[PDB]
Amino acid sequence: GVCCGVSFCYPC
Numbered sequence: 001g002v003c004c005g006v007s008f009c010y011p012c
Contacts, residue, residue, distance in 0.1 A: 003012035 001012050002009050
């Protein structure tokens with residue numbers, strides 16, 4: 001899973 005937001009993705 002990967003959440004790309006605010007010009008940056010995080011391991012969500």
